[PDB]
Amino acid sequence: GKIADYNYKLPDDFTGCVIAWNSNNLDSKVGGNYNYLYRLFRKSNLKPF
Amino acid sequence: SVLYNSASFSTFKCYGVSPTKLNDLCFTNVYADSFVIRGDEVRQIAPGQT
Ligand SMILES: *[C@@H]1O[C@H](CO)[C@@H](O)[C@H](O)[C@H]1NC(C)=O
């Protein structure tokens, strides 16, 4: 996927799981929330973890 | 590579060839199609997918 996906890459083998839940009333700021940042460019890929 | 890196397409997935390897291989007379479809159909174009 995008570079945000390529920032966190899991190994081909992975024991465990992920939990995702919606967050609209706490992480959304009426004036605009900009504390969260992501990566958009890099030299190359990343090893797992 | 550099072309689809900048364009930031929302839907991108390649079958039978890796997108990262695409710069290396050599082809003959690549085709290109183009049309406009309804939203559902964008999740509905795939080989052997009814
Ligand atoms: C639209 O076409 C122009 C042609 O100069 C190109 O520079 C631009 O990247 C294109 N926009 C895309 C691919 O989103």
Both tokens of residue A44? Answer: 């190359």
Q: How many CA atoms lie within 13 A of A6 on its CB side?
A: 13
Both tokens of residue B36? Answer: 């406009």
Spatial neighbors of A7 by CB under 8 A, at least 6 apart, are A38, A39, A42, A46
Å from CA of B38 to ligand 1 middle: 23
Spatial neighbors of B25 by CB under 8 A, at least 6 apart, are B17
Question: Determination method here?
Answer: cryo-EM
Å from CA of A20 to ligand 1 middle: 35
Resolution (angstroms) stands at 3.5
Å from CA of B3 to ligand 1 middle: 9
The 10 Å Cβ neighbour count of residue B22 is 13
* Rounded Cα gap, residues A4 and A37, in angstroms: 10
Å from CA of A48 to ligand 1 middle: 34
Tokens 């090893």, residue located: A47
